[PDB]
Structure formats: C-alpha cells, structure tokens
Design a protein around this ligand. Structure first.
Ligand SMILES: NC(=O)C1=CN([C@@H]2O[C@H](COP(=O)(O)OP(=O)(O)OC[C@H]3O[C@@H](n4cnc5c(N)ncnc54)[C@H](O)[C@@H]3O)[C@@H](O)[C@H]2O)C=CC1
Ligand SMILES: Cc1cc2nc3c(=O)[nH]c(=O)nc-3n(C[C@H](O)[C@H](O)[C@H](O)COP(=O)(O)O)c2cc1C
Ligand code: SF4
Ligand code: SF4
Ligand code: SF4
Ligand code: FES
Ligand code: FES
Ligand SMILES: [K+]
Lengths: 44, 430, 213, 263
C-alpha cells in the first residue's frame, strides 16, 4: 500500500529536553577510542 | 542541452524531501541509501575523489568552490594528527531552510555521505555541527546515527570494509557566524565563534589543529548518490561548470513557499511559476528577488525575466547563487525597510572580531535606519556605497561581504526610490 | 541586554547549582566525544546542559562548567555571552522566539508579534508576571518557507496566523503541549496546493547504479 | 640556504620561510601600520590596519598574519593599500570618543599618530557613538573602555605572558566588551604592562593619571634596582621631578616588560 499522503515524521512530537543528550549517552558505547594529543590540556 | 529545468523524480537525489516516507533505516534502505556502500569504500579514496571531480559538484554552501578539488586537499599522507570531516549544518541564512529538510527527512543519506566523504579524505570521524535551534532535527539525526551504528554501517568496521569512522553531532548555540567554517571550527573547540584568518586553511590546520574539511549538508549528502549513479550522471545536469541538482527555498511573496529539488540552470521565472505557485498578484506584481539568501544582492524584475539559477548566470547578473534561497518581494514591499531589516540581522549576527564588520555593519545599519524614514540627504547614498566598499574584502570572513552586498544591490537597483523617500521626508518635515 | 555581571542575591557565585548524577553521566558522554587534551571542546554542550537542568545560567553554572572541564572561568563567560541561547537571566517556562527577519517579515510576522503581545499582555523582552512566558524577538530560525513561525523552547510553530498562535498560547496556559509543525494545511515544506514534485514512488536500491560497482 | 626571494615595492629581499609580509617589509626598513599586531604576542589579525596590496592579487592581505610566498611584490604605498588604511582608520575612529584632551594617551597615542599618518583628515560618521561601561580591574590600571578599539592585546598579554586567563571579550558585534565580565581585580606581577601595549588610552596608569603629558617629559635611560634582574627602564621626568617609569627593550633581560614594583 503506497502511502504518499501522511507525514511519517511524527516522532519529534515525543521528544523531551534530554533527548539529544540521552542519545549521546546511548551512542557513547559504539564509538572508537579517542585520539590523544599527548598532554592533558594546552595549559598542561 | 540549452533549456534546463523540468527535473524528473527518478533523477532526484533527495527523495523523501517532504516527510511522506519513512526517514529511518527501513525507509532509507528502501529508497536506495546504504546500498553498495562497502563497494564504494573499498575502491579507494582516489576513485571517490575522481567521481566527485568528474561530477562537477560545487560547494552547496554557497561559495561554489569545486567540491572534488576541495576534498582532494586532504588526500595526502598523515603526520600523526587525525583527520576530520566536519559537516556544516548551521544554515543561518535568511531564506535558506534546505539542510533542515535534509537532516530531518533524509538523515541516513547525510550519514552515508559522511562515511563516503570521510573515506574519500581519510577522515577519522565526522563532526556534524548542527544548529542548536534545530533541536528536533538533531535528535532526529541522532536516532538515524544510532540506527547506523546498530547496523554496523558506521563505527568499528564501517559497512564491513575495515574502515573505522565515527559520526558525532555537535549542537550550536545561536550564532549565524558559526556557520562560517573557521568560526564553526572554533565553536566546536569550546570558544567564541570567531573566524580564523586564512591561511591556514582547515585542510592544514582545522578542528583541534588537525586536517579538516568543512562541507555543507547538501554537498555531503549527494556524494553517495554521485558515487552510485556516477559522475557523468550528476554532471549531465545544468550548464557547464554548473553541474547537478539543487535544493531551492522559495519564500517571501509567493503563493506557495516551498523547498523543492530542481535541475541546476532552471530559469528563475520558471522555478517560481512552476514549483512555488508564482508571485502573489501575478508576475507583473514582482518587484525584486533576492536570489540566494540574504547575502546575495537583489535583482529586480527586469533581470529576473531571463535569469538562470546557477552560479555563473547570477554572477553575470551581478549577484551570486549562494544557498539558492529565492526571497520574492512584490510591489507592495517597503524594500528599503526589508534591506534595512537585513542589515539589522547582519549586525546582530556579527562576531565583533575585526574592525570593518564590527564598526561598519552597525554604521550601515544606522544609515539604513535613517534611509527607511528618509532622514538623510542624497550625498549620503554614495557615501554608504563607499562604506560598503570599505567592508568588502577588508574583513576576515565573508560576513562583511554578505553585509556589504545587499546595500550595494539596493543602491544599484533602487537609488531613485531612496531619493524620493528622502525628498518627501524633507518636504513634509521642513 | 548587559554583557557584564553584577552579583545580585539571586545570581552570585554562592547561588546553589550542581548537576544531577544523570547529568554527570551525560557530561561524561559529551566529554568522550572530543579528543584527549581538548576537553575545552565540551564547553558549549555541557553549559547548554546546565541551561536544560536549570532553565537559565547563573554564575554558578558557568563556574561549575569551568571547574569540571578544567578551563578558566573567563573562557566560559565568553561562550555564555557570545551565544544567544544561553539565558543569563531567568526567563519564563515557555520562551517564545518570534522570527522577524526579511523572509518572515514579508509574510507578516509583525501581526503575530503584536498578537502575542496583546494576548500575553506584555511586549518584546518582557516576561508575563506568572513567570510562564518570555517574549523576545530573534533572527532567522531557518524555517523560511514555513514563514511566519515562532519557536517555543525546542519546537517550531510554523505557517502561523494570529488565531493559530492564540490557540497555541491557550493550550500552553492549559498545561498541554502543542504539536510542533505548520499550522496551515501542509505537513512540512511542500507546496501548499499539492505536490509539484516527488509524486512518483522512490525507485529503491540499485536504481541507476553505474557499472563497475 | 632556504631563503625565498620576495619583493617590497619592487625591492628584492631574502627572507626565511614562514616570515610574514610585515616582517619582510620591516627588513627593508618600512614599518606597516598596526594596532593588534605585537611582536611579543600571538598574531591576532583583528584590527585590519595592516592590510597591504600584493600585486597581481585582487584582495589585500593582513600583513601581520599572511606568510610571504616566493615572488610576491608587496606594495606598501599603492593606491588600494592607502584606501584600505583610510577605511580601517575611519571605522576605528567612528565610535571612538573625543577624549584626546582629557586622555592620558594624547601625544603618545598610536591611534592619533597613525590616523595622522595613514587615515584621512575628516569624518563622515553622522551618527551617535557608543559608550561603554568602565571596569575596575585594580588600583594600578585605570580603565576607560569607551576608548577601547578591541585589539585584544589585553587578552593575549594576560593569557600568554602574564599567564592569567582572566581578561576576555564578552558580547558580540559592536557591543563586544573587553573585560573580566565580573568585578575582578587584575593584580598580576606584570599587570601594569598592559598600559604599555594598549595602543589607545583605554588602559592608562592610575598613578601617572592626569599629571604629565609625553612631549614635555625628559627621557633618562636607567636601570631597575627593585630586584636583581637589572631591567632597563626609562625614567621620564618633567622639570626636575620624576614622572613615571617605562621599560626599555633589552632582548636578553626584560624583553620589553617591567614588573609592577618597578613601574
Ligand atoms: N550555506 C549557508 O547557509 C550560507 C552560505 N554562505 C555563503 O558562503 C560564502 C562565503 O563563505 P567562505 O567559505 O568564507 O568563502 P569562500 O571564498 O572562501 O570559500 C569556500 C570554500 O573553499 C575553500 N577555499 C577557497 N579558496 C581556497 C584555497 N585557495 N585553498 C584552499 N581552500 C580554499 C574554503 O576553505 C571554503 O571551504 C558566500 O558565497 C555566501 O553566500 C553565507 C552564509 C550562509
Ligand atoms: C557568515 C557565513 C556564514 C556561513 N554559514 C554557513 C552555514 O550556515 N551553512 C553552510 O553550509 N555554510 C555556511 N557558510 C559557508 C561556509 O563558510 C563553507 O564554505 C561551507 O559551509 C562549506 O563549504 P562548501 O560550500 O564548499 O561545502 C557560511 C559562510 C559565511 C561567510
Ligand atoms: S567580519 Fe564580522 S563576521 Fe567576520 S571575523 Fe570580523 S566581526 Fe567576525
Ligand atoms: S586613545 Fe588616542 S585617539 Fe583616543 S582619546 Fe586618547 S589620545 Fe585620543
Ligand atoms: S583595552 Fe586596549 S589593549 Fe585591550 S583590547 Fe582594548 S584597545 Fe586593545
Ligand atoms: S526568516 Fe524567519 S525563519 Fe528564516
Ligand atoms: S595588525 Fe594585522 S590586523 Fe591588526
Ligand atoms: K595605553
């Protein structure tokens, strides 16, 4: 049934204030190990 | 080919521009995305760069730099620093709302573009700098990125190709100047979004001091379609050095303001009359069109009759293509008030770093605020022209150019309306 | 509209602010997005995270972001004053942002600005006395074909008329949450008199893929 | 050697790679106008006063930041270099206050002197200027921020030489204010040297304030005795009375700074 008449992006009605940051916390395990400059900060 | 436009739906890159299909992975894979991505990634960076160079893709941010020549600046051996693709998703240009639709309704196409472009330039990860006002769009893109990690399409062993590639999303915090690429790079690094002086270009010193390519959402998202469909396919559209499709944002005084994908060198009159429902009150009611968002100079109705909406024809029309955001202004428009609101925008969106923008955009706004009321004299017009010429080319980034150009377009095409404004102020206030 | 700070009894470095522990886990997730040695790159999200926990940024959230990221506090004050989303004053619970640049001014956003003013009884910059609504006037929000539009705290309310924004303000005052989209007939950004494009079904995987691939 | 040949006004000069346009012009004895460049601070490039024409290039470059490429002909006196200097000096003097009589920088002001030498002779700014809240950064440095031209030598000095990181720019656009954002007192051991490098009278000496004026002072070159560094100083006197103490440049001692006890 090819539907072309309804807006399929109804998910963002259900987003809260921490949606982006909870998705970052969820994605924190899938990601590669970060590179290092060799120092803790440019003021170290 | 001589006439351009009338683009077919099979030749669209951004199918599901309107949200009528599923934006998630089950919908994106059913529309052609993430198909044979592994075979693209295994053919090497040089093949992908040659497909992008062959396609004639120019930078969809608005400067129109050749995208393959730009991305080939990263094709060099490393020196210990990582390399990065950074997708400019700010889209602060008044008139422009296309990348919002790309991120919101075709997010996996953007993520696949990040993977293909980062393989093309040897990039370690992708930092998508989305505008912070696009919060629902950013969460939308993060859901698509989570679906891409859970399918093994990005991350460790991306698409089963042995290439490791992350995709990060950094949200902005309300600065149009953080769409400028070096100011965006500064904004990712935890600083004021102040542009850098070039050189170093970001291919030498970019984000965190690494090699970096900053590229628009549209010019990144069309790259897997360019790699699948071919460079000759995308180069078969538009005029020469004007290759491809383009998203257009027709807003203002049209009957149906819309975002639509269209072939590159389509006429402006044909675009407005066909996809936007035409100008309100008819084509005889047209007064001016800002062709590519606020930074491009306006062109009046005599120029808009035969003008083509690619880069070089609007350069010949002494404006730019820009973001291809068509702001239509009919005869019932106080055009001085509109351009002065635009200069008011450019002094609220200006980071105060270098002297000519920090001082002259405020001084242009004060002169334009007096021109709206007409509280001036005609010798101040050419004076204002010179003020714009003292900002154009003397700044760090092109927001000085983007604030000097609307003043120049307004003076150049509507000096008599400015003069009759000021003389009626004079005769009714003295 | 001031870009200096003066210590008031409701905004000083002894104003109580600290993150919740789930906000600390979110901060760790933010900081792990950036390379080692560049922890300062997490100034913009974490500070915005402090705006999401608190609603606004006193000078204890700026100092806390400066402490937990080991960056000087002036470099957080610069980011907080540079960017227009960071509320350095307590705004109301619903922060209405009416775009009045040229593509929204052409489609009569001034009528909606006046309608919100006369409906809420305040003007631009002010706050309703029940601390529920802050009305300011912002630049281009990037919804130009859906002009005239506003933003309420995350949500774009688009293609608005005065009756539409009065309805939105009414159901905000009733405790509900409205639907973030165009308030005209259309769905997101299509031409309002029907689709002039993408009327065919999309072709699917393998269409037009060149040889050798 | 690896020296590249460049040209300043047609004159050949052999420079090291990485040398800027400004340093190549310095090697032929020409000083490019500047406000934010300082040879002991990091390159900022945000006053745009050093914009100079490279020929066969239709855009001026910031000479303080742009490295020379091989074969450039730097046109330090051409028409569009002078037009760039006049435009930038016009924007610097647009919102600058008419304070030259009551300002301690008068007579020894970079803004005055290279407005006389490189800017125009008259104004077109028909508007009202801005006015900035003053700051209290301590008992040594008087702060009048309307005179600030936002060259950020404050911030680069406090960050890189003083090592303080407590000065900065808050705000955005023309409302961008150099300051501490809070009532903070900038008391470093080298805190008075920002009086030196501030090209305008936005940062003046509070003990020297109002008492003298630079043309009437006699400059006696002398030595600090407040510690065993032996910092070379200028004791400026006026009619048999010590007015103030400035640094002398000595590359091997005190490069061009002194301490606050010395000052
Ligand atoms: N897409 C949007 O939302 C907006 C787009 N714009 C457009 O942005 C443009 C100005 O942006 P800019 O990037 O500052 O200008 P453009 O002159 O520099 O450069 C475009 C790209 O080409 C690269 N590039 C240019 N020359 C190069 C060289 N010799 N070597 C290496 N890389 C080089 C730059 O790094 C940049 O990524 C204008 O055309 C304006 O219309 C402006 C505002 C908003
Ligand atoms: C003031 C200013 C704002 C800009 N804002 C954006 C933006 O919001 N989004 C964008 O893609 N490009 C923006 N650009 C253009 C970028 O500098 C850059 O050229 C582009 O993002 C990537 O280059 P590309 O068009 O070749 O892909 C802006 C440029 C300037 C001068
Ligand atoms: S011209 Fe304006 S936008 Fe660009 S660096 Fe200067 S203050 Fe910033
Ligand atoms: S800083 Fe210089 S130009 Fe400005 S008031 Fe003082 S002496 Fe005059
Ligand atoms: S106070 Fe002086 S040194 Fe500091 S930024 Fe302003 S002009 Fe430059
Ligand atoms: S102009 Fe109002 S959203 Fe772009
Ligand atoms: S001196 Fe080069 S720009 Fe300030
Ligand atoms: K001084």
């Amino acid at each position: 049934p090819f539907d072309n008449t309804t807006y399929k992006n109804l998910q963002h009605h259900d987003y809260s204030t921490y949606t982006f940051l909870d998705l970052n916390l969820d994605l924190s395990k899938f990601r590669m190990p970060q590179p290092s400059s060799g120092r803790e900060s440019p003021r170290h | 080919k001589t006439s351009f436009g009338s683009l077919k739906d099979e030749d669209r890159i951004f199918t599901n521009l309107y949200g009528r299909h599923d934006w998630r992975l089950k919908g994106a894979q059913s529309r052609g995305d993430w198909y044979k991505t592994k075979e693209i990634l295994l053919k090497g960076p040089d093949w992908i760069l040659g497909e992008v160079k062959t396609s004639g893709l120019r930078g969809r941010g608005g400067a129109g730099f050749p995208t393959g020549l730009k991305w080939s600046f990263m094709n060099k051996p490393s020196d210990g620093r990582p390399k990065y693709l950074v997708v400019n998703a700010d889209e602060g240009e008044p008139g422009t709302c296309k990348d919002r639709e790309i991120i919101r309704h075709d997010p996996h196409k953007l993520v696949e573009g990040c993977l293909v472009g980062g393989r093309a330039m040897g990039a370690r990860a992708a930092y998508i700098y989305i505008r912070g006002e696009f919060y629902n769009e950013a969460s939308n893109l993060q859901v698509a990125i989570r679906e891409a990690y859970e399918a093994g399409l990005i991350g460790k062993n991306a698409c089963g190709s042995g290439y490791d590639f992350d995709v990060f999303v950094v949200r902005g915090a309300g600065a149009y100047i953080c769409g400028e690429e070096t100011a965006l790079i500064e904004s990712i690094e935890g600083k004021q979004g102040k542009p850098r002086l070039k050189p170093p270009f970001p291919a030498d010193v970019g984000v965190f001091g690494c090699p970096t390519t900053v590229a628009n959402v549209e010019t990144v998202a069309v790259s897997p379609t360019i790699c699948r469909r071919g460079g000759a396919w995308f180069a078969s559209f538009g005029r020469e050095r004007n290759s491809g499709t383009k998203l257009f944002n027709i807003s203002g005084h049209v009957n149906n303001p819309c975002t639509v994908e269209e072939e590159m060198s389509v006429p402006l009159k044909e675009l407005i009359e066909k996809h936007a429902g035409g100008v309100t009150g008819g084509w005889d009611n047209l007064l001016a069109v800002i062709p590519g968002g606020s930074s491009t100079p306006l062109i009046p109705k005599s120029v808009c009759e035969t003008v083509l909406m690619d880069f070089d024809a609007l350069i010949q029309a002494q404006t730019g293509l820009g973001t291809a955001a068509v702001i239509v202004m009919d005869r019932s428009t106080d055009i001085v008030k509109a351009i002065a609101r635009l200069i008011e925008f450019y002094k609220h969106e200006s980071c105060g770093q270098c002297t000519p923008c920090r001082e002259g955009v405020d001084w242009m706004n004060k002169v334009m605020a007096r021109f709206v009321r007409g509280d001036a004299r005609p010798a101040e017009i050419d004076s204002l022209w010179e003020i714009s010429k003292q900002i154009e080319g003397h700044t760090i980034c092109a927001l000085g150019d983007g604030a000097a150009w609307p003043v120049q377009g307004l003076i150049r095409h509507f000096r008599p309306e400015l003069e009759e404004r000021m003389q009626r102020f004079a005769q009714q206030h003295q | 509209a001031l870009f200096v700070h003066r210590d008031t009894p409701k905004n000083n470095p002894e104003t109580p602010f600290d993150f919740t522990p789930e906000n600390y886990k979110r901060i760790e997730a933010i900081v792990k997005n950036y390379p080692e040695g560049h922890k300062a790159a997490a100034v913009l999200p974490v500070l915005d995270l402090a705006q999401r926990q608190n609603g606004w940024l006193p000078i204890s959230a700026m100092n806390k972001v400066a402490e937990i990221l080991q960056v000087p506090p002036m470099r957080v004050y610069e980011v907080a004053t540079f960017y227009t989303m960071y509320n350095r004053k307590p705004v109301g619970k619903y922060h209405i942002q009416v775009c009045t640049t040229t593509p929204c001014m052409l489609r009569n956003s001034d009528s909606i600005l006046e309608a919100i003013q006369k409906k809420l009884g305040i003007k631009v910059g002010e706050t309703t006395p029940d601390k529920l609504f802050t009305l300011i006037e912002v630049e281009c929000l990037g919804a130009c074909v859906n002009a005239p539009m506003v933003q309420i705290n995350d949500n774009y309310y688009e293609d608005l008329t005065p009756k539409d924004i009065e309805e939105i303000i009414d159901e905000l005052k009733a405790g509900k949450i409205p639907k973030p989209g165009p308030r005209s007939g259309r769905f997101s950004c299509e031409p309002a008199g029907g689709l002039t494009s993408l009327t065919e079904p999309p072709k699917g995987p393998g269409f037009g893929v060149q040889a050798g691939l | 050697s690896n020296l590249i040949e460049v040209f300043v006004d047609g004159q050949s000069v052999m420079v090291e790679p990485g040398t800027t346009v400004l340093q190549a012009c310095e090697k032929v004895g020409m000083q490019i106008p500047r406000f934010c460049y300082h040879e002991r601070l990091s390159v900022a490039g945000n006053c745009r006063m050093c914009l100079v024409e490279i020929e066969k290039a239709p855009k001026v470059v910031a000479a303080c930041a742009m490295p020379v490429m091989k074969g450039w002909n730097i046109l330090t006196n051409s028409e569009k270099t002078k037009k760039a200097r006049e435009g930038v000096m016009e924007f610097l003097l647009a919102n600058h206050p008419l304070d030259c009589p009551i300002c301690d920088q008068g007579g020894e002001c970079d803004l005055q002197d290279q407005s006389m030498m490189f800017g125009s002779d008259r104004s077109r700014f028909l508007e009202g200027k801005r006015a900035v809240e003053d700051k209290n950064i301590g008992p040594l440095v008087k702060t009048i921020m309307t005179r600030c031209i936002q060259c950020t030598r404050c911030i680069r000095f406090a960050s890189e030489i003083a090592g303080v990181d407590d000065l900065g720019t808050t705000g955005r656009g023309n409302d961008m204010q150099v300051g501490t954002y809070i009532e903070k007192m900038f008391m470093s051991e080298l805190s008075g040297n920002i009086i030196d490098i501030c090209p305008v009278g936005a940062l003046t000496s509070k003990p020297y304030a109002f008492t003298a004026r630079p043309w009437e002072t006699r400059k006696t070159e002398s030595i600090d005795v407040m510690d065993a560094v032996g910092s070379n100083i200028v004791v400026s006197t006026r009619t048999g009375e010590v007015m103030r103490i400035l640094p002398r440049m000595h590359e091997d001692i005190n490069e061009e700074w002194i301490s606050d006890k010395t000052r």
